[PDB]
Amino acid sequence: PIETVPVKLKPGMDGPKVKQWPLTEEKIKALVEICTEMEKEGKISKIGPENPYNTPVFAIKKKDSTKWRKLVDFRELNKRTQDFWEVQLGIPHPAGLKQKKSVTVLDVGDAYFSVPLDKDFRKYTAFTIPSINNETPGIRYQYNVLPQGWKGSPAIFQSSMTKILEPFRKQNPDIVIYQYMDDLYVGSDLEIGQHRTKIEELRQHLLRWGGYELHPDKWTVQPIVLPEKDSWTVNDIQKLVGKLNWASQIYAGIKVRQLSKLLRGTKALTEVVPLTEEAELELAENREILKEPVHGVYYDPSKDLIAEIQKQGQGQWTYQIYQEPFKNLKTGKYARMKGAHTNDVKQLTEAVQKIATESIVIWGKTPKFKLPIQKETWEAWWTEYWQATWIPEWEFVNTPPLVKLWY
Amino acid sequence: SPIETVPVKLKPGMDGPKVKQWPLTEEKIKALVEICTEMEKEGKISKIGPENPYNTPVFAIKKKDSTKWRKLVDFRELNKRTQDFWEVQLGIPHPAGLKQKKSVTVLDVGDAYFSVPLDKDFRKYTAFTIPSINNETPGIRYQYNVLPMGWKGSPAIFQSSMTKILEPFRKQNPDIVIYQYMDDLYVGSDLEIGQHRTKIEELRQHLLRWGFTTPDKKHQKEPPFLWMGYELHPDKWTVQPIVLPEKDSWTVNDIQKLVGKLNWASQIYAGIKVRQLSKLLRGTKALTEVVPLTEEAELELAENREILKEPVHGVYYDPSKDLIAEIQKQGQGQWTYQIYQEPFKNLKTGKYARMKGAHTNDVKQLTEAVQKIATESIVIWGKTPKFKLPIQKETWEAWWTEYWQATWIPEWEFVNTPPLVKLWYQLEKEPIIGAETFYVDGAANRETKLGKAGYVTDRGRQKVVPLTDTTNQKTELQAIHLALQDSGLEVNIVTDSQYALGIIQAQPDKSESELVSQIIEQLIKKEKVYLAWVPAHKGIGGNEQVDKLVS
Ligand SMILES: Nc1nc2c(ncn2[C@H]2C[C@H](O)[C@@H](COP(=O)(O)OP(=O)(O)OP(=O)(O)O)O2)c(=O)[nH]1
Ligand SMILES: OC[C@H]1O[C@@](CO)(O[C@H]2O[C@H](CO)[C@@H](O)[C@H](O)[C@H]2O)[C@@H](O)[C@@H]1O
Ligand SMILES: [Mg+2]
């Protein structure tokens, strides 16, 4: 019973037309019951084929919450939706979130279900539920309400959200709340138990109007490391010189001329070469330059974030987050702790969720990922391990390791 | 039908079609005043006049009844000007996805599209003219009041209407399975034949209230049921007979037909191959170009015929048992698989033979086949099967540990059905003691098309070979080729080609490139090979000597 906000697509752009991919039995059943209940509650409406738009839909199951959660992949629609920094409905990101001792993520998408959506935009939110063995044609719905996962929902619901959080943030000035899409990131410096307690109080406040724990203090940066030996082969110095030569694109004043001078002549790779005093000097200097962070690299909120990932083996994955090439805002190393140790695709999916989560906490948005995986391998399995209510942009790359920079 | 119409529009700025009819014979146009009069009596069409400026040509083919005719309209222009639709038909049901049912019925709706009304405001665009007397008089013209056959919006609107009409019966009878494909209804149940026929009569009455007739001619009551190109028996299902073309002289189009038929047959006939027959289609220029069968294509065809003359059947799905998919390697990037639950009782079969990428290996292609089978299994049965694969656990472990991209295969067990899938070589992680060290390099001139490839070695050996009509990357691969050619069983190799290192380090066993194929040959024949990279033009070790030598 509220007046809707007029929203439109970006000029010269049409709505999303993305095909539905196959779904397992359990996901289809979950989506059927969820969409049935949403249909009875008026949140969605059944539509026909004269609506030419579509967006893929699937379902996830958080490990700590055994109830299914519907997830619509509105990435295309969000890319085609108007920006809201012109309607002044954007969300400022607080710099204090990444300093907090603990940060709990909360799914507050259900709030969006209390605000109607512009009548002339609803057709862009259509989605189709598939059928096992194609027993029936797909079942099409569209939203009558601010949808979960749509970028316009946090912008339109902003005023409401601030009005609902005002008392809690008033009673707790040193707890930080940052809304990203359907999520609230809640950071505090106090001890674990009372932190979870205040999270419970926050919950009951939200529940009354209408538990994923992170530790940013534990996020370290993994720099470029040089090996340390007593005797060095020709091969060791070739790989060292190549590594440092690549590193001269990122850092400043890195020399190779003396270490490289050691290699004069056509020498056997296994032949041991003694290190010149001047060459040892060069190795110590370059080793020190890599120890301290690079000078002159700053975040630019007008540009997108990009994340690269490399598989290192034995459950280790290195990553870099940058905006311009070789000017890394962050370098890191993800490692799984599940014990099973035998699924590359699961580990990479979890790594993407963790990296994107850190990007939300630090900068307020997710980066576009360059994934070291075949497109079809990723698309065959990634939904089986996804746990976030948001989905980042990604592309697929095949670049073997020339040198092993990050390990 | 009293069903509510579906609003449809033309694309923005577009108008209706204004084309002309063909050929205007008194046999033809008297047949055209013959066919329509009954449709007008039933209300499917209405006469219109010159104040309607649109037109579209009409024709007719013969139905598989072989006595009844099917009226079609060439709506290509109108279709181009009609709004887009989102198609609700996402795939094709498969008999291997059916469960055993006590009682089965197959029904078809009579004149299905003509039972669904068309949007009033849109009807003016479906106008078709039939000349009165060979253009000697204004002319008789009609417009459609129902869904036309040939309009791109008709199938989706009919499917949606049928879904809405069936929904009440579905919700009221959850224990009755209704496969709905266009106007073809499969209806299975675990009821006794009496109450089953009661529910069938109720369903037909429900359809008739909404204007969907179910003629007895298309009402199947006893097995074998003809359904979606298959024959359904109580315990098994078969494909309807597949007749391969038999020609003395083969054209491109004949071979295309043959390959298509063999692909259709591969869903239940195990071991079908089409690689050699499909190779005949490559490089051809016309559909009527005569193509002589190679020896390999004749052998492959004969093997397929031997397979096809043996009777086969699939069985139905038991959800209380596991799905099992077993894969075999057939050679030259060809793979065949069977999906079953009890041994020697296939639910279905299939094959995978796509060449993805310029350079690949058997492990990658086996992974691709696994992914195809997984997707197909999710479509048909809603779950992923357990795999039996001809690859050792050690081979897979080695591959996914050494390879740099993330890869995975779900729960699988090793099955010993040679030829097994294996890695054909492995590059050493450390340099080899006592092995010769080759510093290789190749370079080409892009304007000139000339290049050179050579090496310098730590034992004093050097070589330079000229190359014509080449590229940069080709000269680098050529340098590696030379090093592998002139070295012993064990060799260390140093290059500056990130490209060549990238290809070789992925351990390919096949390639669309002759040069890469030769390199693969040489690598398979070696005993130990260590391959290393250095940056170019930095005056490094032997790399500077060989780079100086090539120039
Ligand atoms: N444009 C077009 N539509 C077709 C064609 N074949 C089938 N359809 C569509 C239109 C049909 O109404 C619908 C059902 O196929 P049917 O073979 O059952 O034809 P229909 O029901 O109209 O006549 P019937 O009483 O079953 O003999 O599917 C075709 O060849 N061209
Ligand atoms: O995995 C990429 C794959 O996803 C699709 C839809 O399934 O596109 C989605 O992902 C893209 C990559 O980020 C987005 O650009 C796009 O907006 C989103 O819908 C396919 O297009 C693509 O093949
Ligand atoms: Mg029919």
Author numbering:
A (entry chain B): 4 to 213, 231 to 427
B (entry chain A): 3 to 553
The authors write:
In this study, we showed that the Q151M mutation of HIV-1 RT confers high ETV and EFdA sensitivity upon HIV-1. We also determined the crystal structure of HIV-1 RTQ151M in complex with DNA, DNA:dGTP, and DNA:ETV-TP, which revealed that ETV-TP is bound at the N-site, directly pushing the Met184 side chain.
The structures of the RTQ151M:DNA:dGTP and RTQ151M:DNA:ETV-TP ternary complexes were determined at 2.38 Å and 2.45 Å resolution, respectively. The obvious electron density was observed for the bound dGTP/ETV-TP and Mg2+. The structure of ETV-TP is identical to that of dGTP, except that ETV-TP has a cyclopentyl methylene instead of a ribose ring oxygen. In RTWT structures, a hydrogen bond is formed between the side-chain of Gln151 and Arg72, whereas the thioether group of Met151 in the RTQ151M structures occupies roughly the same position as Gln151 but keeps the distances of van der Waals contacts with nearby Arg72, Phe115, and C2′ of dGTP/ETV-TP (3.6−4.0 Å). The structures reported in this work have been determined in the rhombohedral lattice system for the first time, whereas the structures of RTQ151M:DNA:dGTP/ETV-TP basically exhibit a typical closed conformation of the HIV-1 RT ternary complex, and thus superimpose well on previously reported structures of the dNTP/NRTI ternary complex with main-chain RMSD of ~1.2 Å11,28,29. These results suggest that the lattice forces and the inter-molecular crystal contacts do not affect the overall structural conformation of HIV-1 RT ternary complex.
